[PDB]
Each structure stands twice: as structure tokens, then as C-alpha cells.
Amino acid sequence: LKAQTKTEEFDAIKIALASPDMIRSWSFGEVKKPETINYRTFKPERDGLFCARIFGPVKDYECLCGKYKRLKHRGVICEKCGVEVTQTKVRRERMGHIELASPTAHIWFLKSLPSRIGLLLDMPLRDIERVLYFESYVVIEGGMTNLERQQILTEEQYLDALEEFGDEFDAKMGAEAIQALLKSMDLEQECEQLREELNETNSETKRKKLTKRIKLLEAFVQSGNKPEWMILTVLPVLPPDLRPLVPLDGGRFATSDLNDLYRRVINRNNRLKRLLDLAAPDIIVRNEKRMLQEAVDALLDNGRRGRAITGSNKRPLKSLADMIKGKQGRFRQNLLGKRVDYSGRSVITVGPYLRLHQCGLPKKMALELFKPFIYGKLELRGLATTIKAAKKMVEREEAVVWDILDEVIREHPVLLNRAPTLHRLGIQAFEPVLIEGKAIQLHPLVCAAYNADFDGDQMAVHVPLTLEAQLEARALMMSTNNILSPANGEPIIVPSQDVVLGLYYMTRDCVNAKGEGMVLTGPKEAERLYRSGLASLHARVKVRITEYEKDANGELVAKTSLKDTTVGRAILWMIVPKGLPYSIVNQALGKKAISKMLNTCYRILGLKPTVIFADQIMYTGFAYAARSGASVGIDDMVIPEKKHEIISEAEAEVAEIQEQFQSGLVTAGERYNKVIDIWAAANDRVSKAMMDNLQTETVINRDGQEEKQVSFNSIYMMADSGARGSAAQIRQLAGMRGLMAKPDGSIIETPITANFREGLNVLQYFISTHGARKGLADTALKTANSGYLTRRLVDVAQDLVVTEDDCGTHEGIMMTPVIEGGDVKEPLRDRVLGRVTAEDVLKPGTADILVPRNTLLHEQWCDLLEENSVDAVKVRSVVSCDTDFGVCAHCYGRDLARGHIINKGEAIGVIAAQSIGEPGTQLTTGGLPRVADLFEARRPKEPAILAEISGIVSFGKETKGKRRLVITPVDGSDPYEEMIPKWRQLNVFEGERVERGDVISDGPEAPHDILRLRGVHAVTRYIVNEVQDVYRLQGVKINDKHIEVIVRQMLRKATIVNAGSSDFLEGEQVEYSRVKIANRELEANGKVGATYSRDLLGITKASLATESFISAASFQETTRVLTEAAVAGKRDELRGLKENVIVGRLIPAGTGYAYHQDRMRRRAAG
């Protein structure tokens, strides 16, 4: 089979240095003139930056001179001026060149931080530049006379040396010299000699640099790049249409900055050739050569010499490097953003009538959006003669088009998105419902996922054009298909505010009301009793209900009974589907409980019933909340009657301590602490006063004299249910609010005595203002911090995707309840839920296996483990996964919007980063910067030192800067002595045995240590526990998984100890290494296998290392990455997400996983 020649579907990409002949290969002509256009007839001057001959025809399929204007004549080169008549797009394609008179250095390889020409020649930068500017002479191929090869001389020195040695000695200067250097260089010889020298002398300083350099050399050799190519003989010119001269309004022209530069280069070059043909003196031609160097440099990358300015404008002209790099930090267009067709946006409204699987869309919007579909469908039925007439029809908006639109809309989903996109739920699919208006209607239950208020937030809409996109949206991005946050299995469809106030008001009981103590047959006549006004919504009543339990095998049991409940609960029970027990609705129904209802319902009945259930809950919530007549008046907020008294007493305390300071019984600062303490305590008192009052004060009579229950007051119900408001804010409404603190952070000792129900005076408000401003500023800052964090996270994970099914390793981490301090800051059941057991676990007695081997632990398994007393479960994690270059689904967990085990091919790194990043706005050393420090693995300010090795220790030597510590193992030797500064108070006992990783001092410790001394599981445990300590303290739920994948990406690199294949100290992928040692344990060398040591790299550091260079060019410094890759001739095979996103082909994950797989195996095979 003939392989191929012409266009195929390409794989990978290659990058390297450019040959003069290769540069010419791209070039379809040499631009010989600085001229652009004729100045009258705007036609291009021949052989110029803009040209028809070299590049392409001005107008489609037409010659410049105008001889052949017909679409027939195509492959024809015109006799007058050769122009092959072809599409003008080719002028966007065909490149060019310029033959430079004097050699020129490529500024990217001169000025890159590790200067390439510099370290390749083992020559310093300042020397090379000094040579390039003709400031001094440099030797080349010195031979045996007096002098080195790389040695540098001066005018007089060169003269004297030449006088002594005429031949067998060589020196040049300028660019020609550096080129001569690079060309005369023999890499192989250097390889041999350097290997020898490496082998001879023993010093660290010597063989370190030695091995680094030989590695560099042989790499550059294997690349295929020859050093000469660092010096440009020929300069390629970019196609004219990529740097357009295109005109504007008012007969004004606008052109890019590349034209100014290129024109300069051409000018100075031609002038150099001219000065050569005139036999000018040395100084002149030298000045010209230097100027040419500067011009070319400014063209390539501007700002590394002089920062040349554009014509008549101060602002420095944008060079090719800036063209590539882009702006906004690192953003390459596939990053910052890209405009997209078939889209729209607008202000959003409520639409409670909507089912949760749909949403409202404006008529006009849907018309303009689906316009092509509308055309094709209009003429498919025959209502329109041709596409033209169809346009005329929809343009006139004839009455017949609306129905056709209703046709094309029906099963066709649309994508909705908000501005602050964090987690995947930031974009969700809905079924369009045509609505009269300009506003988008969005289902209330989803308002939590978007974090969208109704205060003028806008949403954007995208149309899933291709069939695959329709099915992707419907089976993945669909609202109903994600009911559960990917961070934790808890439902994100949880009812929000009005609805929960409705369900709260419904089920609740006042002491006495209509129909108190009566009995009813079923919920039907309970509701019938209520609506007729005979019975009150809340009253204690016994009613017969039929509840189901599916506890049989796949089968619903039915039982009936007389339940003691309320009218409202009875009415609400009608909604509750099937196998849910009545108990769930027999409570007060707070936001938490109303959530657990949906949860249990989902883990029992499945998806569909949970969906319809949730919908019904929303509808009834709204309806009964409406009927409730809940409102808020000025008298709804009740101030304690004892407030003024507390104020006065706490105010007596301040004058007590004041008198004490007057008499000197107490110091100033101690006084300050005292007064601040008494005021704080006062605030606590008033708070717990108004709380009790506003809470239980309702005093009502049933058949007797008195009794008292929880208040029916509005603001209380609101705060208690969880609809909105909280004890903190309610506290500020009735009782006094806090004490404020000046910007310094010094807390003022005169708190705000008044509240919002009362008036605040001038001072109090002024003092509050700072708190407000710092609030908005801090929050607006932490949004950005969160963004940056998520960015670093996705950059470090990304391409991690579920690939293999099961790696099959018994390995895993021990899962215990968190048990911090006092009782259980988080249970065992949550930590082990949805995960998979590494190995079977026992009962108190054994040979009875509850959970066999590796099995998904769902609610039933976890409750079965809860029945038994088992406190200990070993669980498989993504950090310990044996699979290389990915995670096996059997290792990850079940967690997803769906309860089933994680799918094959879903990209977990991304979702992990998103899950860690979404709550980051809700975070307050501690705090969010603490999290950032953790993932960066930064060594703290005042750390602690763990014991290096177990065994008895003692204090060695004396005081100079350190007092040495001598460790003494039981069997093995004791060379180990660590130098610990003695001015730091120690911990370790001079006479006691210390296990490795014990406390030899206090303070936090760097996780590098924990990894090295205490182990891998130990360090991952430290990271996860500390970060979870940060989040959980704020009330944020994040499963250990995501953190664990981030951790796995942190430790991806490790440094070898032993040898037998690769280099000694190389940091490398533990995937590569483990795959190579597992392969070397058998066959190959019998066992040569090399030991490594796991390394801990920070997230921002581990993000630096990526195989694909196109990926690195995205988020890193572009200028360096391109060069540093181009020298080694690095070949990017794609294989990752980011790269395939840039190149614009199907993502090697998700749906595309069936593609890249069926490809990847076809590659490197038969």
C-alpha cells in the first residue's frame, strides 16, 4: 500500500531550527523592495512586502495586469507579470524571504535566559555580544600556536598575534565570527572528551556541570539541528494578508506594525549591499551591519535591545514575538476566549411554571438563532420556493414561520451559561420554550448551580448545531442528568428560599387551631378539610396513611397506620412518591431536612422519581408560601426588654476598670483587654436575650390557661427554616451589632450600642463604613484568588483522565473517621462512601466477609458497615493507582452527578480542580492563602525538623551557629549528624529514643519532609487533612478524591538513586520510571532495576513539565518555551486535552475517547 504524499489527517507536530534552504523552500519569491503600494492605483509594486507575483492576486481568480480575468484560466502564469490566477486566500498563505548580505544572529537564541549560542559554544553571553558589536576579536580554530579556541582578543592584541603567526591561527569578528564558531564546532568529539573528563577527576563542582553539559550536547545532536542555523543567512517574510494594508473610511489606510519593521530590515540590508559595492571604509559598513542586526532583532522579538517605535507614534511597534505571545498575562486566544456563532444572551427572569428540564427563551432570539434550520425546514415542507424566499419570509416574519420554529425547537436542546463559570454546572442544557418577551426564563432550582441572582445577572445561550452536540447536551449537559454536585454526592437541586419557607410553614404545629384533635381517613380529605376553611393548616391531628417500604427484594411492601401528625404534613404527603416512609414528612421540614428528603428519595427510588418529586416540591413550596401570607414589618423584629439594662451594667464595668486605671491598679493594655472583654460579653448577653425572646416568646392557650411554643413570627421562621437570614444578621437587626475594628486591625473599645431597627448616629455609621469597604474589597479580591487557584489546578491536572478500567492493586490508604479533639469532626461513613475497598474487611469475629474485596460501597454497604462496629477500612485511591498515565475507574470512586461508578474516559483532573475551586469564594495561619501554600508545598516560615533516623540521640559539639545532633541506630552505623541551630528551643529528649519523623522541635513542617521521612501515604494524608481542615472549618463539603488527584499530580516526578539505565540524579516521571523498572525486573538485564525516591513538586511547579510543547506555550512564557523546545527538535504528539483544544480537534476524553483510543492503538502498530 502506497503510504501517501498529499493531504491526510495529520498526527503530532514537529518543531526545530530553520535551514536557509528550508526557509527558501517556503519562500515563493524574494522581496527586493521596501515599497508597498503604487500610491495612486493601489495595486502592489512588484517584488515588495505587498506583491502579486511573489504572494498572490489582489482579487479572486484575476491577474494583476488584467489580461486573464476568467475563472477558466487558473494554473496560468501571466506573461506580462507572472501571477497565477487563484483565490486571494493564497495571499494569506504563501510566505517569502530576504537574502541578508551580512550574517545575522537570531535574537531568540542570543537573548533567551539560557543563551543557546552561549551554552552550546560554552561561551559567556557578554563576550558573544561584545563580539557581535565588533567591539573585540574572537578566535576560531586556534590550532597550536599561542592561543585558545574560544579566546577573545583586542585590536592591538590581534595585530601583534597576527604579526607573530600569519597562518595556523584564525580570528574573526561580528556575526560571521559567531557563525564560524558554531560551524567549526564538532559535537561528537566534545562528547568523547567530556565523557573522559567526567570519568577522571572526582569533585562535585566538576562532574555536575560536566554531566549536565554532555547531556545537553548529545540532546542537541540527536535533535538534528546544526548550530549554524542559530545565525540567520535568510530571513522569511510573513504573508501580506496576515499583516494587511487594508483601507478604511475617509480614504484612510491602516496597516500592521510588521510592515514598518520588515521595511526597515529590507532598507538597511539593501543599503548594506550598496555599501559593499561602493567599497566603503570599515567603520561605515560595521555601523550598517550592527544596524541590520538591530533591525532584524526588533522584527523578530522587540524590546530585547532598544524598543524601536512605530512611525509618528510613541507606542513601541508590535513584533512577531508579541504576535505569538498575545497578551493578558499568558493568553493565546484558545485561552482568553473566542467569539462563536449561533449564540446570544440577555437579562434573566424566574419562570416557576417551568419544569426543571426546560427554560424560557425569547421568540425573536430563537428566530435569529435557529435561522438556518428555519430556512431549511421552511423549504423542506415547501412553504418557500428557494432559500432566498425563505429569508424574505422570516424577514417579513410571516405568520407561518412561528409553527416551523415550534417544529425545529421541539427536541432540540440549547446551552445556557453564566459569567462566573467555575464548576461544570456553570453551563447546563435545557429544552427551549418559546416565550413572548425579550427576557430569558430560568428554572429556580437551577439558580443555585449558576450562583445567579435576579438582580440583573445576564445569561448566554449557545445552539448545539451538530447531531452529536444535541445528544451530548441531552445526555450530559442536561439539567435533569446532573442532580448531584460533582464535588460531593449531596443534591445541588436543593430547594432555595421561597419554596422552603412554603414547606416549612406547611409542616409545623401551633398549639391550638381549627380541627385540633380530630381524625381523618386520608390526606385527600385532610386537604379537603383545609381548603374549605374548616381546618387550619397547622394542627395536631391523627390521620390514617398508607406508606410503602421497598425493603422486600426489589419489591414494595405496603402498610397503613394512624399517624400523629399535622394537617399540613398530611396534605404534603400526597406528593411524596412510593417507598418513602411517612416519617420523613412528619418533621418541621427545615432546609437541611428538606434536602435529605430529596437525597434519600434519590438513593431509594432512582433518578426519574427524584426529578418529578423535586419539581412537585418546588411547585407546592411556591403555592403554599404564597398562600401563607408571610411578610415583614418593622414590628416583626423584637428587641430585648432587658437590653438597656445589659448596656448600662456593661457600661458600669468600663468605668470600674477606668477608675482602676485612674488609681493605677491595672496597666493600660490590660485595661484595654478588660474593657473589650466586658463589651464582648455584653454583646453575647443581648444576643442570647433577643434570641430566646424572638424564638420562644409566643405564649398561647389550648383549652387551659397557658403554654408556649416556638414563634410563628415571620423573620424567625425565615431564619430558622434556612430560607434566608441567619442568627448573625438577625442579631444585627434587633440586638447591638458587634464591635468594629479600624483598618489597622485594632478593635475599638466602644462597640456599636445601637442596631438597624433603632437608628445609628454619625459615628457608628462612619465606623461601620470601613467594615463594609473592607468587606467588598476582600470578597472581590478572593474571587480573583479563587480564579488563579482553579487555574493553577486545572493546569496541573487537566490531561489526567480515566483510561484503563482496573489497575488491580491491593494498594490504598487507611480510612478512619477524622476524630479531632473532642467528638468526631466528620464520620467514617462519609469518608469511605462511594469509594471502593482495597481488600475484604471483617466483623468482630472472622471468616465472615461483609464487603468482599473491591466493591463499590453505596448507602446500603456503608450502613451495613455502620450496623457492625467496624472502625477501620482500607480504601483504593487515585494517588496509589498502579495505572500509568491515567487513573483506573476501579481506583477512583463512584462520585458523579449519577450514583453509578465513574465512567471510562471521563476527565477527572479537570472536574477535580473545578470542585476544589468553586467553594474558594466562600473561604476566609489559615484561610485561602493557606490552601494556596499547601498546594504549592511551600516550606513554612518557622518549620519543625523531624528525626532523620530512629534510635537514641545525643547533643554533639558546641556553639558555633549550630549545636550538632548525633543519632545512634541500634544495629546500623551512625554517620548521621544533623546541625541544628541551638538558639531554637528544642523538644527531643537528650536521653531518649526518637522514631524517624518525631518532633525534634515545634511549628508546622514542610511536606517534602513528610514525604521523605514519613512516607507517601503519610504526606498525601497530611495534605488532604490540612486542606480539608481549611475547607471544613468554613463549612465546605469536598470529597477527599479531588484533592487526592491533585496530590497525585504533585508527586508525578521523582529523583533516581541507583542506576543501570538512565542518569543518576534525574527528576523524571514515576510513570516512565516505574514502567521501566517493572520492565527491567524481567527479561532485559536480569535485574538491573534502579531505585528512585518520590519527589514532591508544587502545583505551579509540576504544571511546568508537560510533554506537549504546544500546551506549554499556552500558560507558560511562550518566548522561552518555543525556543527551548525548538533546539531539542521536540515532537509534540498531542495526546492531551489543552493541545487538542488549541489545534482544534476532538478532545482525547469524554465522547472523543472512543476516537483517540481507536487511533492511539492503530498508531505504533500494524
Partner 1 sequence: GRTTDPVRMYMREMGTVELLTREGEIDIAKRIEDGINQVQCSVAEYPEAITYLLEQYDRVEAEEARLSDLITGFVDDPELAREKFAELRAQYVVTRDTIKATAQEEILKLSEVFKQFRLVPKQFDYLVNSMRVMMDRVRTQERLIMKLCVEQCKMPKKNFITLFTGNETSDTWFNAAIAMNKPWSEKLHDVSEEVHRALQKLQQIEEETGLTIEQVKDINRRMSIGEAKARRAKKEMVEANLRLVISIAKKYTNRGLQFLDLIQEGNIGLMKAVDKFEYRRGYKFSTYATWWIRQAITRSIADQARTIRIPVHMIETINKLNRISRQMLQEMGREPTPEELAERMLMPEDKIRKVLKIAKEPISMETPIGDDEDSHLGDFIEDTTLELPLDSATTESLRAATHDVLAGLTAREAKVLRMRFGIDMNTDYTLEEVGKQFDVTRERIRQIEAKALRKLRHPSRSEVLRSFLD
Please state, in angstroms and as integers, the Cα–Cα distance from residue 305 to each residue in 298, 314, 1118, following that order: 8, 17, 19
Task: Choose from Mg ion, partner 1, Zn ion, none: what does 453 bind? Cβ within 5-8 Å by kind.
Answer: Mg ion
Given the DSSP bridges, would you call strands 171-172 and 137-139 parallel, antiparallel or unpaired?
antiparallel
CB of 126 to partner 1, least distance (A): 9
Task: Specify the pairing of strand 343-349 against strand 813-815.
Answer: unpaired
- Applying the rule CB under 8 A, the residues between 111 and 170 that interact with partner 1 are 129-130, 133-135
Answer yes or no whether residue 281 interacts with partner 1 by CB under 8 A.
yes
SS3 assignment for 733-758: HCCCCCCCECCCCCECCCCCCCCCCC
Tell me how many residues contact partner 1 (CB under 8 A): 72
| Contact of residue 135 among Mg ion, Zn ion, partner 1, none (CB under 5-8 Å per partner type) | partner 1
Looking at 184, 223, 255, 334, which residue binds partner 1 (CB under 8 A)? 255
Residue among 600, 1022, 525 nearest 813 (CA): 1022
Q: Which amino acid, 323? A: M
User: Under the phi-then-psi rule, with left for phi > 0, alpha for psi from -120 to 50, and beta for the rest, what region is 174?
Assistant: left
**Residue 125 beta carbon to partner 1: minimum distance, rounded to whole angstroms:** 12
Among 195, 318, 596, 1135, binds partner 1 (CB under 8 A): 318
- With CB under 8 A as the contact rule, the residue among 195, 207, 271, 724 that binds partner 1 is 271
CB nearer to Mg ion: pick between 455 and 703: 455
CB of 1139 to Zn ion, least distance (A): 25
312 counts as binding partner 1 under rule CB under 8 A = yes
862 marked among binding-site residues: no
For residue 485 the three cell numbers come to 454536585
Crossing angle (nearest 10°) for helices 498-506 and 714-721: 110
Q: How far is the CB of 457 from Mg ion (least distance, A)?
A: 5
Q: Which residue is nearest to Mg ion (CB)?
A: 453
- Compare residues 452 and 767 and give the one whose CB is closer to Mg ion: 452
Determine, following the binding rule CB under 8 A, whether residue 964 of this chain makes contact with partner 1: no
Nearest 5°: phi and psi at 544? -80, 130
Strand partners, 519: 542
> What DSSP letter does each residue of 161-189 carry, written as one string?
HHHH-SSS--EE-SHHHHHHHHHH--HHH
Stretch in the footprint of partner 1 (CB under 8 A) among 163-171, 259-267, 447-455, 479-487: 259-267
Q: Measure the CA–CA gap between 238 and 925, rounded to whole angstroms.
A: 54
Spell out the alpha helix ranges (H) of 606-726.
607-628, 643-663, 668-696, 714-721
Q: Which partner from the list Mg ion, partner 1, Zn ion, none does 99 bind, CB cut-off 5 to 8 Å by kind?
A: none
Which has the closest alpha carbon to 265: 326, 317, 226?
Answer: 317
Backbone discontinuities in the chain, residue before each (C to N > 2.5 A): 924
Least gap, CB of 253 to partner 1 (angstroms): 4
Distance (Å, whole) CA 91 – CA 73: 18
Q: Least distance in Å: CB of 779 to Mg ion?
A: 12
Q: Which of 43, 67, 305, 898 binds partner 1 (CB under 8 A)?
A: 305
Q: Does the footprint of partner 1 cover residue 251 (CB under 8 A)?
A: yes
**Rounded to whole angstroms, how far apart are CA atoms 491 and 840?**
30
Q: Are strands 977-980 and 963-968 parallel, antiparallel or unpaired?
A: antiparallel
Per the document, the length of the chain is 1166
Is 65 annotated as belonging to a binding site? yes
Say if residue 891 carries a ligand binding annotation: yes
Residue 305: contacted member of Zn ion, Mg ion, partner 1, none (CB under 5 to 8 Å, by partner type): partner 1
Q: Which residues pair with 349 in a beta bridge?
A: 441
Closer by beta carbon to Mg ion, 46 or else 782: 782
Size of the site for Mg ion (CB under 5 A): 2
Exposure on the CB side of residue 328, measured as CA atoms within 13 A: 8
C-alpha 537/C-alpha 177 separation (Å) is: 97
How far apart are the C-alpha atoms of 557 and 576, rounded to whole Å?
16
Taking the complex as a whole, how short is the minimal distance between the CB of residue 490 and partner 1, in angstroms?
40
Answer for which of 20, 124, 236, 326 binds partner 1 (CB under 8 A) is 326
Residue 322: count of CB within 10 angstroms of its CB: 17
Q: Least CB distance from residue 325 to partner 1, whole Å?
A: 12
Q: Which of 856, 878, 705, 746 is nearest to 803 (CA)?
A: 878
Q: Are 1048 and 881 in contact (CB under 8 A)?
A: yes
The dihedrals phi and psi of 207, each to the nearest 5 degrees, come to -70, -20
Is 301 annotated among the ligand-binding residues? no
- Closest by CA to 572, choosing from 530, 532, 517, is 530
C-alpha cell belonging to residue 766:
462612619
455 annotated ligand binder: yes
Residue whose C-alpha is closest to residue 795's, from 1043, 1103, 1053: 1103
| Phi, psi angles (nearest 5°) of residue 1138 | -45, -50
Which amino acid belongs to residue 521?
T
Residue in 106, 268, 591, 737 binding partner 1, rule: CB under 8 A? 268
Task: Find the shortest distance in angstroms from Cβ 456 to Mg ion.
Answer: 7
The Cα 935–Cα 920 span in angstroms is 14
Select from 453, 848, 971, 1083 the one that contacts Mg ion (CB under 5 A).
453
Binding mask 45-74 for partner 1 (x = CB under 8 A): x------------------------x-x--
Nearer to Zn ion, 80 or 126 (CB): 80
297 contacts partner 1 (rule: CB under 8 A): no
**780 binds Mg ion, rule: CB under 5 A:** no
Q: Please give the radius of gyration of the chain, using alpha carbons only, rounded to the nearest integer.
A: 38
- Using CB under 8 A, which of the segments 283-291, 496-504, 515-523, 827-835 binds partner 1? 283-291
- In whole angstroms, the minimum distance from the beta carbon of 294 to partner 1 comes to 6
CB 387 within 8 A of CB 375: yes
Burial of 974 (C-beta count, 10 Å sphere; 0-12/13-18/19+): middle
Is residue 631 at the binding interface for partner 1, with CB under 8 A as the rule? no
45 touches, from Mg ion, Zn ion, partner 1, none (C-beta below 5 to 8 Å by class): partner 1
| Contact window for partner 1 (CB under 8 A) among 145-153, 326-334, 445-453, 925-933 | 326-334
78 annotated to bind ligand: yes
Q: Does 283 bind partner 1 (CB under 8 A)?
A: yes
Does 43 bind partner 1 (CB under 8 A)? Our answer is no
CB atoms within 10 A of CB 716: 22
- Chosen residue from 13, 95, 194, 275 binding partner 1 by CB under 8 A: 275
CB of 66 to partner 1, least distance (A): 17
Q: Which residues bind Zn ion (CB under 5 A)?
A: 63, 65, 78, 80-81, 807, 881, 883, 888, 891
* Least spacing, CB of residue 361 vs partner 1, in Å: 22
- Whether residue 447 is annotated as binding a ligand: the answer is no
Say if residues 671 and 660 touch (Cβ distance below 8 Å): yes
Q: Which does 891 bind (CB under 5 to 8 A by kind): Zn ion, Mg ion, partner 1, none?
A: Zn ion
Sign of CA dihedral 256, 259, 264, 269: positive
Q: Is 601 annotated as a binding residue?
A: no
Site for Mg ion in 488-547 (CB under 5 A): none
Q: CB 1066: neighbour CB atoms within 10 A? A: 14
Q: Does 1131 bind partner 1 (CB under 8 A)?
A: no
CB of 610 to Mg ion, least distance (A): 29
Question: Least distance from C-beta 46 to partner 1, angstroms?
Answer: 13
Does residue 359 have a known ligand-binding role? no
Report 368-407 residues binding partner 1 (CB under 8 A): 372, 375, 385-389, 391-392
Footprint of partner 1 on 72-111 (CB under 8 A) = 72, 88
Binding site feature residues for Mg(2+): 453, 455, 457
Question: Per the annotation, where are the binding residues for Zn(2+)?
Answer: 63, 65, 78, 81, 807, 881, 888, 891
Annotated binding site: 63, 65, 78, 81, 453, 455, 457, 807, 881, 888, 891
Question: Could you list the residues that contact Mg ion (CB under 5 A)?
Answer: 453, 455
